[PDB]
Write a protein that binds this ligand. Structure first.
Ligand SMILES: [Zn+2]
Ligand SMILES: [Zn+2]
Ligand SMILES: [Zn+2]
Ligand SMILES: [Zn+2]
Ligand SMILES: [Zn+2]
Ligand SMILES: [Zn+2]
Ligand SMILES: [Zn+2]
Ligand SMILES: [Zn+2]
Length: 259
């Protein structure tokens, strides 16, 4: 129940009614070698959180089911966490190397060049948005998912963030992405991408996704809850039940269309 981002969605979707469909389409048309990027350090521990990795993983799993290849660029602690899922890690990634670069909950620099958390605490850690500024310049397909306004891709709608989101002027990221997905919780944004791509392809790419398994797993591995900054199996302060609810609802929707 976060009011600012809810208002940014109404504004955004209102003028870009088809962002999810356009996003899903760019995705489906550039599967050859997809670089997926996640990991949001949380001040002051600067430890990544549970929002982002789950979604990146679902996209990765989906990219492979479709026949493409995916690698993940993220932080150390997330690699450990995502380790049980046998995910290919990116090694000295170069934009030129991919056909598409996605971002699920990743700090995007602000207008002042620095990085900030929803609480405007500066993030001090090596950035991961650079490759996006480069991807953009080269014209490589780029997609970004966020739920607050300080994530890579949110630069596409800074006016909206600055207007409805607390600390906006300072927090808002200037990094833009070709397509942008905004959702209450980024993971859910990635799941939407997968559900939309499922309807488009006629296969439910989300069938089998175990929300609970993944949250608990990565929470044990060390990834924290962004709001409680604790080690609870939750993402952005919402507990597993609601999250499973949304994933099960997305699955239902995918089927309804496919079948
Ligand atoms: Zn407005
Ligand atoms: Zn280059
Ligand atoms: Zn505040
Ligand atoms: Zn966020
Ligand atoms: Zn989040
Ligand atoms: Zn279509
Ligand atoms: Zn968060
Ligand atoms: Zn259920």
């Amino acid at each position: 129940g976060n009011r600012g981002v809810l208002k940014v969605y109404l504004d955004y979707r209102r003028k870009n009614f088809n962002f999810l469909h356009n996003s899903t389409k760019m995705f489906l048309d550039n599967l050859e070698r997809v670089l997926i990027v996640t990991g949001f350090p949380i001040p002051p521990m600067m430890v990544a959180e549970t929002d982002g990795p789950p979604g990146a993983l679902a996209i990765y799993r989906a990219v492979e089911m479709l026949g493409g290849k995916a690698e993940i660029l993220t932080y150390s602690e997330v690699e450990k966490a995502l380790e049980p899922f046998g995910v290919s890690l990116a090694r000295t990634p170069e934009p030129e190397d991919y056909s598409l670069i996605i971002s699920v909950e990743t700090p995007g620099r602000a207008a002042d060049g620095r990085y900030y958390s929803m609480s405007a605490l500066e993030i001090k850690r090596d950035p991961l948005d650079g490759i996006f500024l480069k991807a953009r310049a080269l014209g490589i397909p780029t997609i970004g998912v966020g739920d607050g306004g300080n994530e890579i891709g949110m630069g596409k709608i800074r006016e909206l963030v600055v207007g409805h989101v607390p600390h906006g002027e300072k927090i808002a990221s200037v990094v833009e992405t070709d397509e942008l997905i905004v959702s209450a919780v980024s993971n859910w944004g990635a799941y939407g991408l997968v559900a939309q791509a499922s309807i488009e392809v006629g296969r439910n790419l989300l069938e089998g996704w175990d929300e609970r398994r993944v949250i608990e797993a990565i929470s044990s591995a060390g990834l924290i809850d962004g709001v409680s900054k604790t080690l609870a199996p939750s993402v952005d302060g919402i507990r597993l039940m609601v999250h499973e609810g949304i994933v099960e609802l997305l699955k239902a929707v995918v089927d309804e269309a496919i079948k």
